[PDB]
Amino acid sequence: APDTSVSNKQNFSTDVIYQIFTDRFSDGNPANNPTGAAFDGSCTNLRLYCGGDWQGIINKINDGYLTGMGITAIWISQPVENIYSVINYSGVNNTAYHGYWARDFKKTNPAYGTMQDFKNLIDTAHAHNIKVIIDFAPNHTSPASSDDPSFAENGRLYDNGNLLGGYTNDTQNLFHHYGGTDFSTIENGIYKNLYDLADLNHNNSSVDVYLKDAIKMWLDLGVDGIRVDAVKNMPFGWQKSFMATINNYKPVFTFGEWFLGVNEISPEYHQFANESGMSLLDFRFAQKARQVFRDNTDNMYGLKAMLEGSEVDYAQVNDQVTFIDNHDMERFHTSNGDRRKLEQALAFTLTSRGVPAIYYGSEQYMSGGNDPDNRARLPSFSTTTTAYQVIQKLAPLRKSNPAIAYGSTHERWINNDVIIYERKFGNNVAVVAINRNMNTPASITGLVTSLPRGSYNDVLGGILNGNTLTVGAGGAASNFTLAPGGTAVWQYTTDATTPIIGNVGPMMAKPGVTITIDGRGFGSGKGTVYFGTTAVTGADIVAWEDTQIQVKIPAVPGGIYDIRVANAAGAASNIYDNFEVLTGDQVTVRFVINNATTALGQNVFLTGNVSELGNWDPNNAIGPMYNQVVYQYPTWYYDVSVPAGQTIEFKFLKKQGSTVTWEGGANRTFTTPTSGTATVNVNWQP
Amino acid sequence: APDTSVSNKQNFSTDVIYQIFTDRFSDGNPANNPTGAAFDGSCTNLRLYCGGDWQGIINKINDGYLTGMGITAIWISQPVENIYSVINYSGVNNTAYHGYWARDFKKTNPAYGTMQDFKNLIDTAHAHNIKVIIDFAPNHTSPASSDDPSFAENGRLYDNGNLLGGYTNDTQNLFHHYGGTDFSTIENGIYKNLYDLADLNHNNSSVDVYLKDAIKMWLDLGVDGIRVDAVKNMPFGWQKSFMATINNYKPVFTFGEWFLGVNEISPEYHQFANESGMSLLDFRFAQKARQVFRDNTDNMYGLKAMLEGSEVDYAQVNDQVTFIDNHDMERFHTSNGDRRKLEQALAFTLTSRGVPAIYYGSEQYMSGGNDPDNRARLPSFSTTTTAYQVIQKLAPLRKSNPAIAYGSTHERWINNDVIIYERKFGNNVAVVAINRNMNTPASITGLVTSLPRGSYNDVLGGILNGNTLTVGAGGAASNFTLAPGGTAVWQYTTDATTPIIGNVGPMMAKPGVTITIDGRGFGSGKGTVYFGTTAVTGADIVAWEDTQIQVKIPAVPGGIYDIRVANAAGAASNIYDNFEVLTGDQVTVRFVINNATTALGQNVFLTGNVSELGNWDPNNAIGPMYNQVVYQYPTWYYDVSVPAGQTIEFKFLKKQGSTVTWEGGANRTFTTPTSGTATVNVNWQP
Ligand SMILES: [Ca+2]
Ligand SMILES: [Ca+2]
Ligand SMILES: [Ca+2]
Ligand SMILES: [Ca+2]
């Protein structure tokens, strides 16, 4: 199938995502509305249910509101049954309208609809070439107090109607009982509770296989993507085994949320995007875009430095989901803010690298502060606002122009208030110019681009005061004045002759799984795919066409590989690196070591004989291990995804800067479980 | 040995070349000075001999003039015996002071010195870590008139004293007798005479073998590079077999001259640098730098465009020889012009990509218009000019900082008078900021860089009004003012842990010859070099160390290959592409096809069964063939380098853009000569 079909569940850079808070979009079925104190039909108390549901989304796909905008993916609230309690916090009544307070991960929330309504949503979205991403929040169930079992539903967890357990009298230890986080430490934020939400214990084997069984059910119902909540607050080792479960089963595009504040650049965040198996909501993009286009706290050089810097820091930049606001932020549009700011920031996001997500109601210029004020019911389904029109004009270009979908980003002209950049993939190019100064025109002189000679019409049709670009010989453009607030988009597409890989999905799986490689210039005839120097041809290539090949991962040793495609004539593509071949299916084992005394700046690490443990290399060793909440120093512990059903060999080590201290003695050995979890508890061998 | 060694004859990116017109530099021995009408000791007549010689260059290496400047390579006039005539040209006497009127390519020009003075120069140069490049002008011999055998020495050619022939009564056709070129076409400028110079006929086997034996004896005398003259005026097919002779014998850095005018970009120019086996004097760079830094006919956005554009148009941009003037241009410094322009431009060339060449006397602010005026005698050997100090401070950076010698180039801040660019290679960085406005300061706000946080002295020590850089978090620099005419250079070096390939020389050779791969992070233990998927290891790696590996080309099919290095631990480098492995030793064959009538822009091409002929791919066929000068349409002809001593199968084809019309019949066959040339004259087969 082409890279652009709705059947491509693995990669979304040709898509534009519309993020829907289901309750606040459209009430298509009033009979499923909550009653009593849980409901507010006027939606003036934004913490109660307003009545929006899956029938309401179906109605707006059908009548052309969503498809007229060029949206090709919908991202909806978590679909799982939530608690029914109306919780009064400080006088304010609160409900699970948002879908984050789960009680049964195997049933739907009846206010949004029945399992048949969910199937109908999948089927009419797909019939309209719209992909469906669901939230999934496996960190916790719902508000609970172990001291007061009468509060809310005591965080109880059910399994398709069957009670597994509650927070008070938790003898199975389905939950963590360490108190609440003060967010001081990543370890602290993982094993202690977020606010009052009952924290699931992923080291309990029943919780581990339940969550993994529940996600396969939703994959079986046909979802196309997963947004997982609170990625910074679950064990990274357990999340990599959860990603291995979905990738070795039915790989779909998965991304997480790790919040980043205004000038925060976090190494851990980048590491997570690069090694977890999932990508991330690009907060670095969103915060710098708001500084330059909304708040005016940085200028175009900051924007340039973020575009340039993030193409290198994210190993797979085309998998990051970009945005300019979402339910975790004040809406971009303010009351005293010029609407042209929002229209330019949406044109910047729609033509930039990654996977663009538009928060519902942006095209109707909704404003509002933080939660819950950024979640009002959307006020109009007007199809004639300028903002609706810029998305309608730009969002189809991600399917039609591979430079917008996959291309590199190159700044061609800049000053404090103007950036014009070029996106390029093979022979396909898009050029966009934006003047964020609403008062001053900009004189553009000396612009050169990769466009062939011609008179390019602005894809936005002058609605954001863009103009035609006249390109002469050698990509040189005739000089022009960019209007105050001006934004124009110019483009050119042709066939690629060379194989060029634009995106690969999934990026981590065991031998035998089918991977999807997307690009241009692969040719009609089946060629060769290289994982390192291993060539796979013939029957292992399950599908081959010009924009997409689907191929089975060969039986190579675990580790990370470069991928390269050679068309049938022997011409090879660019390298797409950092693919991780797993040793096999994964399980997460807690490693605990006692009496591992350390100096200031010295920490304990784990390494062993399988790629998942870094293949005996101290620079790739697992850790630093934790030592405050579940166990305390000199006991250190860590949850690690490791191959299932195998005897691994391993050793602990201490690292202080360049100095490695291996424990003495024979290598340790352990036979991992085939499913569930396990704990190894050992003592430092001098 | 390390990449920066004087023994690295293959790659010169770490070097600074000083271009010397031997006769206009230093007369170290007056006894070899020409007498009478041929000589002018005051050097006021710039067309006569002034006395400069090889002994004088030895004196300036020994008294510390050249070595104090930091120069590491010297490029001198053609060393070959020239004609002795004083030629008149409208009452203006002219001599061969410039070395361009060769008589015998196996002897020295005695005004420059003896074979023993030449060996002494090589040895004094190498003792003081200076490489020696010679001009080589194989296109012609000297001024000749076939009508008047008494003019000049009638272009006579000798072979080590034995007369081979002259231009009048050239019974063995040593020369072209087609009349003179009007430069209308590439073909016209190749086979007709340039001005009045007797044009050598490289299709003659005696001329062909003579020139290739002549170059090999200069390589045997120890020369480290070759600049070949009039590269646009000799057959590409003959020049490629010449390059293969050098590269399959004793590969040294060789580059040619193909003149480009202001704003002239020639695709045949780029094709030649990318496919001939030699690189080129970077006229594209030189012309744009003069427009920005001297003449003010473009600004910093044009410089940016040249810099970004040429990085993709030259397949190996690190092999191009950059400069701001030379013997074919008016001198950069203008009489009573601002010296700061010349010092700025020198600093720009010295820190940009490629191999920088400084024309002698630039550091003494020599001014002069076109030939002979751009070659007066150097007026001073002063070591304290600001221009001498700029070269002295910046030339060593190409040896010490690999970001200067091999790095990528990236604009970080720009407006029409200021550019600040970064060079980057691994974690080594250099950033240089140039304000070309001599009267206005510039406030640099928003400079983001890859420098580690810290303060950085200007390496020029403030001589061109530079300043200290304070880099804070994330490479963001504190606001500062760039003075009028301010140029500052700031750098950071650290050792590289992963292998990075910065340059490969030679780029075209048969199996079995040793190539030199230069870069950083290779490690001290042998690893692997891949030519495609063919891993070369062990005894085939002649030498390995962290900055340089020497390895023998494996016995792979002729074609072009990607090179990659994997160090002893398996971390692989970047790909260095476009390496050509030849099928074997090369001979030039002239292919002639008669009765090949074509349509509106339909042309005749050649392809066949060896890589040198495109391996039967019509998109890679040799041509369009020629049909004006040596043979006339519908007879077409071309001179093609092909593997020597083997049977080739070939066929002609016509291409109407995308339509290929092939000859009918069976494939043609020819067994190529082992040396010398051959001619295949055939008729079109339907
Ligand atoms: Ca409803
Ligand atoms: Ca948690
Ligand atoms: Ca002399
Ligand atoms: Ca010629």
Swiss-Prot record, chains A, B:
It is an enzyme of class 2 (transferase). Substrate binds at Y100, W101, H140, N193, L194, Y195, D196, R227, K232, N233, H327, D371, R375. Residues 1-138 are annotated as: A1. Residues 139-202 are annotated as: B. Residues 496-582 are annotated as: D. One of its GO terms (molecular function) is starch binding. Keywords: Calcium, Disulfide bond, Glycosyltransferase, Metal-binding, Secreted, Signal, Transferase. Residues 407-495 are annotated as: C. Disulfide bonds join C43-C50. This is Cyclomaltodextrin glucanotransferase. The lineage of its organism: Bacteria, Bacillati, Bacillota, Bacilli, Bacillales.
